[PDB]
Amino acid sequence: GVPTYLLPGSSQFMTTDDHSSAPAFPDFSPTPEIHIPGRVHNMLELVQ
Amino acid sequence: GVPTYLLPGSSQFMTTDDHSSAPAFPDFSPTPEIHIPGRVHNMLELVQVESMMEINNVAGSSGMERLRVEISVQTDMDALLFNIPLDIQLDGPLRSTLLANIARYYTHWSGSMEMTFMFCGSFMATGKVILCYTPPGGSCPTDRESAMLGTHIVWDFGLQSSITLVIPWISGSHFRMFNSDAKSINANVGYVTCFMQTNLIVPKEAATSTYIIGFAAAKNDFSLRLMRDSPDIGQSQQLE
Amino acid sequence: GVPTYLLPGSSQFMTTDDHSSAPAFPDFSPTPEIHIPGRVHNMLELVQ
Amino acid sequence: TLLANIARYYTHWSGSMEMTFMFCGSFMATGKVILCYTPPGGSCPTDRESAMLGTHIVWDFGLQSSITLVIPWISGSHFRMFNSDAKSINANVGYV
Amino acid sequence: EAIQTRAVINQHGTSETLVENFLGRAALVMMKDFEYQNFFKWTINTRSYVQLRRKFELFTYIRFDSEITIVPTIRLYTSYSGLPNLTLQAMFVPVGAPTPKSQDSYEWQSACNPSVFFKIDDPPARMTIPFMCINSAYGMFYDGFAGFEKTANGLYGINPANTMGNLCIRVVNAYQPVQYTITIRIYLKPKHIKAWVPRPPRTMPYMSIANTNYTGH
């Protein structure tokens, strides 16, 4: 096997972490995206 | 999956570990760095800065009086002016220098040291003094003859007001015996001692008392190791 | 993350293991080695 | 404004601001008004003379019904002193 | 009394005000207690708390995947401090499936509803629910009715396609001799956010959960 050792904060749950998770529906194939006008990429577009 | 097995000290928290951690603000974009003058990369840059010594060891002198040694017409040739033990861990003139204060954060030190003295008398005031260097393990001179017999410079402060001494090597550490409670202190690594060669000569209108101030700093070959806690303040008892 | 599973003897401490450990003084820079005569590489040199 | 409502979700803001005014009187209605800008740290004008003495536009709304002001820079944040409970509020960054 | 201070705000870049970062924060969407009804049942929505609802109502159409983290805590009653390491079962029930009615109902073994088995003394459970809506995006606002029946006429603004499903959490372990209360915290982090048609922010207090009515102040 791979010799590994655990670090501080190993089992912690941080509300701002960025990790992949386990998909609940591995074969769902969601609804295709269609064109909807007025998309917003940046909140700065709202203040102008 | 990956077959893994845990090691000793797997969940331990060592205060000196070097590991990446989870960022709390992944998209903060901190303030841009701007140019600020006088950046410091190495703590060794601090000890090469010249700093004053307390060359006045007369008991009872306080404050600014500790920073200057008085030469008067009453002072007789020859008399001992001041003595500087070149140990940056015991009480002495070097205890107030930047070099000593920084080195108190470390255990072992070695390298060369620069030393400068300034005569702050009047313009026409003139005289001769002898600055002596005693290597480690030697005997500190007791009179002008012994000082002259060793490594020395005959300084005529009437001509030039600044003289610079280059100490070849100083070294020291902190020790603790194995099975004994006896205290171990690093031995002396030499002295720098001043003896009056000729009496002070001043005009009638000038003052009859003058002063000498001193500075000390390390060279570029100085080094420090094994950072520790400075006992300069202390006074803590229960990790309040 | 990496899907991993633990093995038998995962948290054990074997007195004859050979693993790297955490350095207590990461920036100590120990004393340089100097030449000392009469080095011994093999204990067999002693019996001859 | 939308700008204020969005910026209330953030702490530090900086940049320029656009401002427009519209006169909704009748067609033949006419007159003159003075729009003044006071930079941050200045004194708000108290009469027409002080407003004219600063950065300003003399707006004749009889001719054109819309005028646009360009504010050079506004800035602000939220502050909290270290060892004191006294409230800290960002200072004014100018008036129009 | 307020101190009028200021600072030279030096900053640049717009990566923080991205919509993926604006709505991409894991927020607490539900917190419920049950003393060993007898189990946790809650339909997933983002309108439970006013802050998140106001943030989400800034756009008309939003499409996102849902990341759910379940943080359980147990407090005992009356006498040691040993919290049992119970096993928990969180099952996601889509809209087209029935939901359990009791602790030992038959739906807990559905084999089509995804379920997570996790322990109290373990890291919190976490699973990602994809975009399951019948439409291309969720409708934050709906100006219409579900149908033509008189029953639907009392359901203005409710689009049945906008429901997100049910999260049912139970304690698989049987009734222990001791008495305990389980607190469940549900954290929702949207992923792959896409938003359309921004709207004026809400400026008035909410009067209900499904009608956008307003009252004074």
Add this chain to the structure above:
Amino acid sequence: EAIQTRAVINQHGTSETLVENFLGRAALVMMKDFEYQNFFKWTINTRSYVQLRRKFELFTYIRFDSEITIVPTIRLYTSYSGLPNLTLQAMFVPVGAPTPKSQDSYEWQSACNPSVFFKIDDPPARMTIPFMCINSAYGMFYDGFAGFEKTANGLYGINPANTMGNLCIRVVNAYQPVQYTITIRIYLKPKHIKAWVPRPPRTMPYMSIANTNYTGH
């Protein structure tokens, strides 16, 4: 009585006296107890203990990221030796946000203040807080006033831009039947240190925490 010994100190290299190593040591910055006020609240600063303060006051301007490790310990009262495996919540509150006032205050679900959920019997929690100051570097010394108000005139040397934020730690688990005391240790390890304008070291005892006053000895 002291033994005058000596050794031939043989060493070279300057990598140890780097500023990144001089101030880059994880030091204990706070230690507080609370018996289940009722929770841990403390504004982050490096002047709490005299040693670290004296080390940091060797420079005028320092810019660094903060690494925080929280080490909790629990001791019971009056009768088994079973320490409950409680869940802890440490939330970092920046300067522009309000701080909680009670155990169950609304700010614990802020969704914008980062929070860490960790257990007693787990490895200590650890998170990195970046350089959040409004200026390019923290000011170890400030020769000025916050404002012009008479209130600010009593706050010499206090720059509101130098505050680092608040760390609030609570026990999410409800009140257990047993009585326990929680001890919290906060360890701060600066990262990416940059320092400017070195200063003479402090040689005199400190008289307060925010004025650099001095007294005898």
Add this chain to the structure above:
Amino acid sequence: ITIVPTIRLYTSYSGLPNLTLQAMFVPVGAPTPKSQDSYEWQSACNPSVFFKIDDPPARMTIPFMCINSAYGMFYDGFAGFEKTANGLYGINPANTMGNLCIRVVNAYQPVQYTITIRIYLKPKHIKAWVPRPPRTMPYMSIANTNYTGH
């Protein structure tokens, strides 16, 4: 160094508390703690390890910290010239390796327990010089290489 702690209770369940332990290495140039709650436990320069009873044993590596190039197994000399040092034959202050202080961070629990600490030392990167005849006689002390009968 690997630290293996074990705890045995007294007088009544078999539940061993999962206490937190703190092992700190103090080099020769630093003071050592005198009590459980002494100030040196937060030295911030002495490395410390926080680990739990029910975890894998703590393990850390201490480098070659001697002032000399190698440790002296034998020293034919004295520390200094003082009369105090004359009673310390064979003791070289440069050969000390440091102190290991281990405490229980957790406060006094209501129950009574005894903690046993086992310290395991595994040398690494060994270099040895000048082999010597093996010891053939019983040791009489720890720091003098005295010998007695048998």
Add this chain to the structure above:
Amino acid sequence: VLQLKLGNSAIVTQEAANMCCAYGEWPSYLPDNEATAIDKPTQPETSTDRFYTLKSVKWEGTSTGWWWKLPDALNQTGMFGQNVQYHYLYRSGFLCHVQCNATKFHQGALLVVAIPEHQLGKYNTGTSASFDDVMKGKTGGVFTHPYVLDDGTSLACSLIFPHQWINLRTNNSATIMLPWMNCAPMDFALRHNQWTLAIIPVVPLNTSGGTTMVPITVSIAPMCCEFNGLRNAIT
């Protein structure tokens, strides 16, 4: 004998103008890439770039030292004072000049040290220094405990700051050039000081048949003043 001329002001010196640039940096201007993210400052190269000669102070045998805080010393003096009072944002360097007038029969040494961010302290009290204690204007302050630099540090280690020595038997002039010393691109002049020009008599002034008092002249010139624009068009 040379002259230091800046704008319409000139100072005659004793050729000892070996200028000491603090931290080896000349005061230049706010860099272009640091000005895009903040308010755009103009460059009033007006009479602000002249020497301002304060009132001469008396050096006696019991003097403890004098300090001046910048830009507080010039906040109510001339065009610089006007621009400070009318603009809310400022950024400038400085060029401090110190001169002494003494005969060949006088003695004494002055340490002219420019201390950045000198947070003044008190003695045997917990309350911080009041507003009047710090902001002393062009009159300047007087050291009470020069041995500790009035802040608990050591004057002995103050040599690490940009400094010059005035030894009456060698020279009588000191010139320290101070760049912008702040953690922000620009700052507020009215309630924050960047430098503190201190003149501590390390060696007391002494004489037998002299005047027992010599004057010390301090001249300070802002170098690269920049203020917020007060006339940007709003069209």
